[PDB]
Amino acid sequence: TYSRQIKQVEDDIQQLLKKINELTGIKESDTGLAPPALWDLAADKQTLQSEQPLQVARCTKIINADSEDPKYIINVKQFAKFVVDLSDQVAPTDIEEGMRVGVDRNKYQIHIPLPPKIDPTVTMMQVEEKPDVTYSDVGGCKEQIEKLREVVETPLLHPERFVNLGIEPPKGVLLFGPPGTGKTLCARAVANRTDACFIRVIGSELVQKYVGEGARMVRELFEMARTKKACLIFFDEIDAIGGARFDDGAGGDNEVQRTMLELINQLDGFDPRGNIKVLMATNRPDTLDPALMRPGRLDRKIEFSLPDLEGRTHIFKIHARSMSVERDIRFELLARLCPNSTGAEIRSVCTEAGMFAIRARRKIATEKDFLEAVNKVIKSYAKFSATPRYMTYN
């Protein structure tokens, strides 16, 4: 009824919000500047306080000390080397050799030790954040879930039942099967439930242009692994990181083999890694080198096969619990119609048959809509099917 009276009372304050917030100051879309009233701690004090008593303290690297005297041999990025001194702010204890320290620009003396260098693309692959996959969603392979879980988390969540028995639990485990079987999806639940550093590694991220370049990434990776108390290291598609050694004539594929041998040395012998747990995942496990296949690195060897009948029905109950359906259908008929099938294929059946409900104008799918999914996904897409040479893994 009051067409202008609602409209101008709307509009004058929808503009006047800007007309007073300009008077406050949120404007001048920056080039890298703060909100104008957040830096007010450094309005006056830290302008002449974080700058005028403070200095650059350029960071360096220790070569070695000497006896009887400090006389520290220092090193910098490009420039020369010096024989430097402490400050009074430090004891000479934690000024150990091969260490980064912060050093003033004029006297060239040492202020504070630093954490060492970490290569940045190794820092990127720390996960920092967790997915949402719950162990309810990996239904069908419960014995594999338990046999994995007893290695992964039980010494971490309970480091007393193994100690008071007097056993060292296994530290290595690989996971393998056909594609789409639930390996990576099974790992996402591990990343869900876990609490420590879950450092993921995909093997194709380690192929580098320079010679031996990836091996140093492996080294620094296990360095920051050894910095933490407990840590989980995830490996995916390790056929790229190594098959075997087969060189002949023109020696090819060597650069992968050097990084793989470095991974071997970082896994076993000569300062063992301690509380670091690894986890591999491949598609075809036959190509792998047997020294990598040696236990002590790859203890648990979990098979992933297709579910028998009941695991398949359970997968139907997982992917099919959350969609508007006819109530009185049965899934066991569908699991009879899918002898050899993965949970990905079953998910494509459910998510396809919902689209069969969206075909004409229905809101709840039917059993014959499921039948229209089965012949298409199984039998019409049955030309490709992706499975059988991966059943023999060749």
Binding site: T1, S3, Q5, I6, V9, D12, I13, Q14, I20, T24, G25, G32, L33, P35, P36, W39, A42, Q46, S50, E51, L54, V56, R58, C59, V76, K77, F79, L114, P115, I118, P120, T123, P131, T184, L185, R188, I202, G203, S204, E205, V207, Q208, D236, E237, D239, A240, G252, S322, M323, T342, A344, R347, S348, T351, E352, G354, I358, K363, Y381, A386
Partner: protein
């Protein structure tokens, strides 16, 4: 800016009056609230006194730095342009959230302390493969197919335009879409139609140019590619001719097939990574569908498989009707004789015969196209 997203009465109501009247009171309260500050305390003006004081802090030479670590009490190790890195402190007008490892900042000239960050410039790779505008005409240009058009709108367009149908259903859209058939059947043409249709960001890359001459630059290019595709919005990633990564070998590749393989491994990760993917759609096309790795083809990574047949003759006459629409056609010609000239001709062949016939018209400067233009036009196009 983001002040009241509640617009749901959508009428002349006392609610929509009072929403503003309340916010009218709050914001007049903020006006006369701050009005005492510039009348009572003009010591700091806060429009140019504090900002000019920041500009008095920062020097006029503003050196550009590089981030590699963060220590939280506003000092960090930052890299110089030469490489001789420092351990400077960070100021407080520095908006402590954009700072990531590898980011570029602004340093002091004197003590090299972190003045601010810099919103870094783009385009090394983004505007190479980002599609600028709508390429061509609409789905009415296609004709004759009419079924897989519903399939592609089904998997791609409808989840965008109607995000209610899947939520009333309890379902997510199918992930992967692949195209295959004989060459010249309109695989790229349908992608032009979708690129006309959509509103999301659209990315296109040939499957040939995935390969590199340096080792690992392939999979690195893959990782930064899906980085770029993820970081913007709900986009559409198009890949044409992905057989060519498997068919041809090039001597610029210092690696053999066991580097192409590793590129396909990293790509195989980037379709179905354990990471949260996001609103990214994948559309693929080839003609040798039998050659490539089926682990890429499995449901879960590619859901919908779409065959393109050769056109039937009633679709062929429709395609003749399309490509002979806006041309001055003399009545000498009969399209039906032109239909059965080749038993398995394509729309590209039809368009080639039409355009080459127009070239035969322009050789003789004419405007209409005669029959013998088509008679020698099929001789030029077809047989050699």
């Amino acid at each position: 800016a983001s002040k009241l997203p509640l617009v749901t009465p959508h009428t002349q109501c006392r609610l929509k009056l009072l929403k503003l009247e309340r916010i009218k009171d709050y914001l007049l309260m903020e006006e006369e609230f701050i009005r005492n500050q510039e009348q009572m305390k003009p010591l700091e003006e806060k429009q140019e006194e504090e900002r000019s004081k920041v500009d008095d802090l920062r020097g006029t030479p503003m050196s550009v730095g590089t981030l590699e670590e963060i220590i939280d009490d506003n000092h960090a190790i930052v890299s110089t342009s030469v490489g001789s890195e420092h351990y400077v402190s960070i100021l407080s007008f520095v908006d402590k959230d954009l700072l990531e490892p590898g980011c570029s900042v602004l340093l002091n000239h004197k003590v090299h302390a972190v003045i601010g960050v810099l919103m870094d410039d783009t385009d090394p790779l983004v505007t190479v493969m980002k599609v600028e505008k709508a390429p061509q005409e609409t789905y009415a240009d296609i004709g004759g197919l009419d079924n897989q058009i519903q399939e592609i709108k089904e998997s791609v367009e409808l989840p965008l335009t109607h995000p209610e149908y899947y939520e009333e259903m309890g379902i997510k859209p199918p992930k992967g879409v692949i195209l295959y058939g004989p060459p010249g059947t309109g695989k790229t043409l349908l992608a032009k139609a979708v690129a006309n249709q959509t509103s999301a960001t659209f990315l296109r890359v040939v499957g040939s140019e995935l390969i590199q001459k340096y080792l690992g630059d392939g999979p690195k290019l893959v990782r930064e590619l899906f980085r770029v595709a993820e970081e913007h919005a709900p986009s559409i990633v198009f890949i044409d001719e992905i057989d060519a990564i498997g068919t041809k070998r090039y001597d610029s590749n210092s690696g053999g097939e066991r580097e192409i393989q590793r590129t396909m491994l990293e790509l195989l990760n980037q379709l179905d990574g354990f990471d949260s993917r996001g609103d990214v759609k994948v559309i693929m096309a080839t003609n040798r569908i039998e050659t490539l790795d089926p682990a890429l083809i499995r449901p879960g990574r590619i859901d919908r498989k779409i065959e393109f047949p050769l056109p039937d003759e009633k679709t062929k006459k429709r395609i003749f009707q399309i490509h002979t629409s806006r041309m001055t056609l003399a009545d000498d010609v009969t399209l039906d004789d032109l239909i059965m000239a080749k038993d398995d001709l394509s729309g590209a062949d039809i368009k080639a015969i039409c355009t080459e016939a127009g070239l035969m018209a322009l050789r003789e400067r004419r405007m209409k196209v005669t029959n013998e233009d088509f008679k020698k036009s099929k001789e030029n196009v077809l047989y050699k």
